[PDB]
Design an enzyme around this catalytic site. Structure first.
Site, PDB file in Angstrom:
ATOM      1  N   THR A 181      32.689  22.581  46.226  1.00  0.00           N
ATOM      2  CA  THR A 181      31.466  21.800  46.289  1.00  0.00           C
ATOM      3  C   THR A 181      30.268  22.585  46.796  1.00  0.00           C
ATOM      4  O   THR A 181      29.190  22.011  46.973  1.00  0.00           O
ATOM      5  CB  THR A 181      31.633  20.546  47.128  1.00  0.00           C
ATOM      6  OG1 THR A 181      31.887  20.920  48.491  1.00  0.00           O
ATOM      7  CG2 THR A 181      32.771  19.674  46.544  1.00  0.00           C
TER       8      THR A 181
ATOM      9  N   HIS B 101      37.111  22.456  57.085  1.00  0.00           N
ATOM     10  CA  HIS B 101      35.734  22.308  57.519  1.00  0.00           C
ATOM     11  C   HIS B 101      35.361  20.875  57.168  1.00  0.00           C
ATOM     12  O   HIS B 101      36.168  20.141  56.571  1.00  0.00           O
ATOM     13  CB  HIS B 101      34.799  23.259  56.760  1.00  0.00           C
ATOM     14  CG  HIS B 101      34.878  23.106  55.275  1.00  0.00           C
ATOM     15  ND1 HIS B 101      35.822  23.731  54.488  1.00  0.00           N
ATOM     16  CD2 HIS B 101      34.176  22.298  54.440  1.00  0.00           C
ATOM     17  CE1 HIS B 101      35.667  23.285  53.231  1.00  0.00           C
ATOM     18  NE2 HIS B 101      34.677  22.413  53.157  1.00  0.00           N
TER      19      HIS B 101
ATOM     20  N   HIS C  30      26.489  27.068  56.672  1.00  0.00           N
ATOM     21  CA  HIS C  30      26.475  25.809  55.919  1.00  0.00           C
ATOM     22  C   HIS C  30      27.435  24.779  56.509  1.00  0.00           C
ATOM     23  O   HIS C  30      27.283  23.580  56.283  1.00  0.00           O
ATOM     24  CB  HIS C  30      26.735  26.004  54.414  1.00  0.00           C
ATOM     25  CG  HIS C  30      27.771  27.029  54.077  1.00  0.00           C
ATOM     26  ND1 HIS C  30      29.103  26.718  53.899  1.00  0.00           N
ATOM     27  CD2 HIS C  30      27.653  28.347  53.792  1.00  0.00           C
ATOM     28  CE1 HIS C  30      29.758  27.799  53.513  1.00  0.00           C
ATOM     29  NE2 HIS C  30      28.900  28.801  53.440  1.00  0.00           N
TER      30      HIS C  30
ATOM     31  N   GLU D 136      30.998  13.750  50.762  1.00  0.00           N
ATOM     32  CA  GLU D 136      30.697  14.331  49.453  1.00  0.00           C
ATOM     33  C   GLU D 136      31.242  13.368  48.407  1.00  0.00           C
ATOM     34  O   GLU D 136      30.509  12.924  47.520  1.00  0.00           O
ATOM     35  CB  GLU D 136      31.335  15.723  49.341  1.00  0.00           C
ATOM     36  CG  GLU D 136      30.781  16.668  50.407  1.00  0.00           C
ATOM     37  CD  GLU D 136      30.760  18.111  49.956  1.00  0.00           C
ATOM     38  OE1 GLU D 136      31.843  18.670  49.736  1.00  0.00           O
ATOM     39  OE2 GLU D 136      29.665  18.685  49.816  1.00  0.00           O
TER      40      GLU D 136
ATOM     41  N   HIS E 278      37.696  18.675  54.749  1.00  0.00           N
ATOM     42  CA  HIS E 278      38.290  19.367  53.625  1.00  0.00           C
ATOM     43  C   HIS E 278      39.297  20.391  54.157  1.00  0.00           C
ATOM     44  O   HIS E 278      38.904  21.349  54.844  1.00  0.00           O
ATOM     45  CB  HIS E 278      37.189  20.074  52.797  1.00  0.00           C
ATOM     46  CG  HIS E 278      36.326  19.137  52.006  1.00  0.00           C
ATOM     47  ND1 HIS E 278      35.088  19.515  51.529  1.00  0.00           N
ATOM     48  CD2 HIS E 278      36.567  17.853  51.651  1.00  0.00           C
ATOM     49  CE1 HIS E 278      34.607  18.457  50.903  1.00  0.00           C
ATOM     50  NE2 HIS E 278      35.463  17.425  50.946  1.00  0.00           N
TER      51      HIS E 278
HETATM   52  N1  QOZ Z   1      33.784  22.341  50.048  1.00  0.00           N
HETATM   53  S1  QOZ Z   1      35.124  22.865  49.339  1.00  0.00           S
HETATM   54  O1  QOZ Z   1      35.063  22.541  47.945  1.00  0.00           O
HETATM   55  O2  QOZ Z   1      36.258  22.402  50.086  1.00  0.00           O
HETATM   56  C1  QOZ Z   1      35.149  24.625  49.441  1.00  0.00           C
HETATM   57  C2  QOZ Z   1      36.265  25.241  49.983  1.00  0.00           C
HETATM   58  C3  QOZ Z   1      36.298  26.619  50.089  1.00  0.00           C
HETATM   59  C4  QOZ Z   1      35.215  27.381  49.667  1.00  0.00           C
HETATM   60  N2  QOZ Z   1      35.270  28.787  49.798  1.00  0.00           N
HETATM   61  C5  QOZ Z   1      34.388  29.696  49.329  1.00  0.00           C
HETATM   62  O3  QOZ Z   1      33.356  29.411  48.733  1.00  0.00           O
HETATM   63  C6  QOZ Z   1      34.760  31.127  49.682  1.00  0.00           C
HETATM   64  N3  QOZ Z   1      34.226  32.123  48.754  1.00  0.00           N
HETATM   65  C7  QOZ Z   1      34.642  33.472  49.136  1.00  0.00           C
HETATM   66  C8  QOZ Z   1      33.989  34.496  48.238  1.00  0.00           C
HETATM   67  N4  QOZ Z   1      34.315  34.262  46.826  1.00  0.00           N
HETATM   68  C9  QOZ Z   1      33.566  35.199  45.959  1.00  0.00           C
HETATM   69  C10 QOZ Z   1      33.779  36.640  46.407  1.00  0.00           C
HETATM   70  C11 QOZ Z   1      35.056  37.115  46.682  1.00  0.00           C
HETATM   71  C12 QOZ Z   1      35.266  38.447  46.993  1.00  0.00           C
HETATM   72  C13 QOZ Z   1      34.195  39.315  47.052  1.00  0.00           C
HETATM   73  C14 QOZ Z   1      32.918  38.853  46.805  1.00  0.00           C
HETATM   74  C15 QOZ Z   1      32.711  37.525  46.469  1.00  0.00           C
HETATM   75  C16 QOZ Z   1      33.935  35.005  44.494  1.00  0.00           C
HETATM   76  C17 QOZ Z   1      32.973  34.719  43.533  1.00  0.00           C
HETATM   77  C18 QOZ Z   1      33.339  34.524  42.211  1.00  0.00           C
HETATM   78  C19 QOZ Z   1      34.658  34.644  41.828  1.00  0.00           C
HETATM   79  C20 QOZ Z   1      35.617  34.958  42.767  1.00  0.00           C
HETATM   80  C21 QOZ Z   1      35.257  35.134  44.093  1.00  0.00           C
HETATM   81  C22 QOZ Z   1      34.035  32.871  46.441  1.00  0.00           C
HETATM   82  C23 QOZ Z   1      34.685  31.886  47.384  1.00  0.00           C
HETATM   83  C24 QOZ Z   1      34.099  26.751  49.133  1.00  0.00           C
HETATM   84  C25 QOZ Z   1      34.071  25.372  48.999  1.00  0.00           C
HETATM   85 ZN    ZN Z   2      34.044  21.226  51.688  1.00  0.00          ZN
END
Ligand code: QOZ
Ligand code: ZN
Length: 260
Positions: free
Chosen positions: A199, A95, A65, A107, A120
């Site tokens: 996001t 990123h 992504h 965004e 970000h």
């Molecule tokens: N664009 S932004 O808003 O700056 C943005 C920045 C970082 C992210 N990072 C993530 O989405 C990374 N994930 C890692 C996995 N995480 C899961 C998970 C953790 C451990 C094992 C399996 C899944 C997660 C889901 C629900 C609650 C806690 C963790 C969610 C966050 C996303 C968006």
């Molecule tokens: Zn982002």
């Protein structure tokens, strides 16, 4: 994780995310449109403190992504604090989100204006021990957002542009050490701030957003390279990685505060 299927296509894009991630229609979703005339100056806000002199990057990854430049966050290095934050937040990765055209890509928007891209810089609150526990807290993360406009090149971004050739498709990564993120910051640290969320799915409402007013300029050629990346993995139909941005979401019951 392994069964997610969300993306930015017509059948799995932002308007579809709520089916697998109900929090998409939540009360503190990001991004949002920053209405500059309604953001109120808050004299109590402290100057932002960005200390990246000891930041140590490790690798760059195309995750399907976007591409993340990851940092070694096992020690107290590269911290964001001050501003609207209580405590200290540690840099884990940065990123960007960008468009298929210079006219779109960011965004967050400013009085509905869309920038060509948005950087970000993601940090987690050290009081929670690690990133995994921090994302489960309302004040778990602090993301520093910086708008990119097309004009003069940003010298500091070139190492990133050049290594993209080695991570064209989903799942590819490449060593990326000694990259200095201070090379991506504008002159002024004036900012807007509000409570929001990730996001991209899981869209957790764990982010204190800090969006800088001053965009940085990057060249047409630099952003063109971003647009040559692929959402797909090697050996699959080529889908250019462009327009990987979520549109502005309802502000609902929130106020955006200005540091200036
Ligand atoms: N664009 S932004 O808003 O700056 C943005 C920045 C970082 C992210 N990072 C993530 O989405 C990374 N994930 C890692 C996995 N995480 C899961 C998970 C953790 C451990 C094992 C399996 C899944 C997660 C889901 C629900 C609650 C806690 C963790 C969610 C966050 C996303 C968006
Ligand atoms: Zn982002």
């Amino acid at each position: 994780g392994m069964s997610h299927h969300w993306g930015y296509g017509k059948h799995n894009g932002p308007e579809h995310w709520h089916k697998d991630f109900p929090i998409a229609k939540g009360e503190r979703q990001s991004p949002v449109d920053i209405d500059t005339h309604t953001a109120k100056y808050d004299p109590s806000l402290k100057p932002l403190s960005v200390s990246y002199d000891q930041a140590t990057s490790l690798r760059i990854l195309n995750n399907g992504h976007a591409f993340n430049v990851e940092f070694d966050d096992s020690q107290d290095k590269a911290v964001l604090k001050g501003g609207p934050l209580d405590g200290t937040y540690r840099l884990i990765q940065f990123h960007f989100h960008w468009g298929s055209l210079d006219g779109q890509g960011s965004e967050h928007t400013v009085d509905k204006k869309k920038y060509a891209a948005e950087l970000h810089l993601v940090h987690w609150n050290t009081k929670y021990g690690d990133f995994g526990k921090a994302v489960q807290q309302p004040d778990g993360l602090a993301v520093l957002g910086i708008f990119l406009k097309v004009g003069s090149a940003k010298p500091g971004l070139q190492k990133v542009v050049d290594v993209l050739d080695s991570i064209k498709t989903k799942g590819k990564s490449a060593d990326f050490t000694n990259f200095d993120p201070r090379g991506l910051l504008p002159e002024s640290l004036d900012y807007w701030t509000y409570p929001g969320s990730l996001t991209t799915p899981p869209l957790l409402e764990c982010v204190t957003w800090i969006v800088l007013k001053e965009p940085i300029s990057v060249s047409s050629e630099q952003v063109l390279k971003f647009r040559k990346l692929n959402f797909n993995g090697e050996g699959e139909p080529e889908e250019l990685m462009v327009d990987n941005w979520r549109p502005a979401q309802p502000l609902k019951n929130r106020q955006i505060k200005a540091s200036f």
